[PDB]
Amino acid sequence: YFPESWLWEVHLVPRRKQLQFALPDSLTTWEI
Amino acid sequence: DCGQMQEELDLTISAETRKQTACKPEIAYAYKVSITSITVENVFVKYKATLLDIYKTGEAVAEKDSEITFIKKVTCTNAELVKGRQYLIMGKEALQIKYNFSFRYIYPLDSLTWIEYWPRDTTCSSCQAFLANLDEFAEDIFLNGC
Amino acid sequence: VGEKVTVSCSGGMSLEGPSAFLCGSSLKWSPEMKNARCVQKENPLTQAVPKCQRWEKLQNSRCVCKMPYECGPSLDVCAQDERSKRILPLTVCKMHVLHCQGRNYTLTGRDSCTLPASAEKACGACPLWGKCDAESSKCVCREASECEEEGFSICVEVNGKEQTMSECEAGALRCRGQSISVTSIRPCAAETQ
Amino acid sequence: PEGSEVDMVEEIDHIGIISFPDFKIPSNPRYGMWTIKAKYKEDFSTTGT
Numbered sequence A: 001y002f003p004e005s006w007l008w009e010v011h012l013v014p015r016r017k018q019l020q021f022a023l024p025d026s027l028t029t030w031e032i
Numbered sequence B: 001d002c003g004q005m006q007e008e009l010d011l012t013i014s015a016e017t018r019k020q021t022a023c024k025p026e027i028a029y030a031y032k033v034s035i036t037s038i039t040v041e042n043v044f045v046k047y048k049a050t051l052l053d054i055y056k057t058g059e060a061v062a063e064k065d066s067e068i069t070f071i072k073k074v075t076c077t078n079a080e081l082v083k084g085r086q087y088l089i090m091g092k093e094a095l096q097i098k099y100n101f102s103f104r105y106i107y108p109l110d111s112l113t114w115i116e117y118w119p120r121d122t123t124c125s126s127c128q129a130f131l132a133n134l135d136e137f138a139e140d141i142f143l144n145g146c
Numbered sequence C: 001v002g003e004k005v006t007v008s009c010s011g012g013m014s015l016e017g018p019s020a021f022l023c024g025s026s027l028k029w030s031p032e033m034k035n036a037r038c039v040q041k042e043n044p045l046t047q048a049v050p051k052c053q054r055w056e057k058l059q060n061s062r063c064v065c066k067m068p069y070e071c072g073p074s075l076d077v078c079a080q081d082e083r084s085k086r087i088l089p090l091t092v093c094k095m096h097v098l099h100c101q102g103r104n105y106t107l108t109g110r111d112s113c114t115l116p117a118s119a120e121k122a123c124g125a126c127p128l129w130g131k132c133d134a135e136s137s138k139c140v141c142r143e144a145s146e147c148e149e150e151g152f153s154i155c156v157e158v159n160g161k162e163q164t165m166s167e168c169e170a171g172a173l174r175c176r177g178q179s180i181s182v183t184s185i186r187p188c189a190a191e192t193q
Numbered sequence D: 001p002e003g004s005e006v007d008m009v010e011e012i013d014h015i016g017i018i019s020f021p022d023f024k025i026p027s028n029p030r031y032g033m034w035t036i037k038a039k040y041k042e043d044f045s046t047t048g049t
Helices: B015-023 B127-145 C092-100 C167-175
Strands: B029-037 B048-054 B084-093 B114-117 C004-006 C020-023 C078-079 C088-093 C130-132 C137-142 C153-158 C163-168 C180-184
Touching: B015 B048, B015 B084, B015 B114, C088 C092, C092 C137, C137 C167, C153 C167, C163 C167, C167 C180
Parallel strands: none
Antiparallel strands: B029 B048, B029 B084, B084 B114, C004 C020, C078 C088, C130 C137, C153 C163, C153 C180
8 A cells, every 4th residue: 555644634523533544554653 | 598509410319308398388489490580689689480380389379481580699609590491499489569569479589498400301311310200209299289 | 524425336337536535624525526437338349259160279359270289189080191192190180270270181091090099998098979987997988969079070981871970979989889980080072952 | 946836726714724625746847845835815914834
């Protein structure tokens, strides 16, 4: 797969919210 | 790709080893023909031909007499070819694409290939047993194959 | 905002474009098309039928010969040299593939050469006209309905008369010990009307 | 990077977040430090960069 960036998203958080997603094949630190 | 050829007019050489060689999974060009002419780009001097017969002109190939190239390279000095000479050989099939609709039967003449001269007269040249052994090998590939 | 959508054309209809989209601030959708193709050429070219034959191997949407070695499973018979009167063993498909390649050949009588298929075989080496019997070391000849091989059609004398039949049927008659005599690897004139 | 302007794009603000269409880099670019300037298309200056 190998992205340089992702998760580029906007959400309403009604005091708590949870998202679920695949981390990519890149064996590197992802800064969120 | 560079290797070496067998010597011309070899006395009583193993004809069954030729069948084994032509049967190999790496073997998919095999024919008897005249060498016709040669070319210039030194890693693929083209070596045009006059097709007499074929036995495992294999992968996506067709019927004989096509007179196509069988290229050569400068480091293969033990595999020299003579213009107008009849010859026998075996090796891998051609890379099948080019600027034309196909590169079909443009032979690579690569390393570890079989090569030898094919006798144009054998009655005069002592015992015809060497040319007859080649004819028995060609008959065996045509009848039994691999 | 932040809700996502996934898109497809209806069943069996070929959609062109990106698969999924996300609702941004309050109006945008990205990266969806302005105009699109929900459906396409879902049916390929069919029955192209290149011109094969028993001595043949059609290719590139056209007819062609087969290799004589690929024709090697054909029934064994007597034949003669391409430029001499001398007799030798041969197979009908290998001879036909050679003639398709423009090579010379000649015919011979049913006893003119030491053809390996000239009588009934043992188990473990049976021709296409037979098979091994259960718990037995001998081969058995099949019926003409057991024709799993494609086969040539050939000319043979039976009951005192020349008749055309399938190569596998002539092979079954030969293996079972029926009174026959092969006359050519080509079919007879007998089907003329 | 040569200071020549190459596009403009507008979007309305609903949230205090404003997501713009994904500007594709032109088919042969000048490499180096492109700049994004932003202004309200209203009676405000408010340049951000």
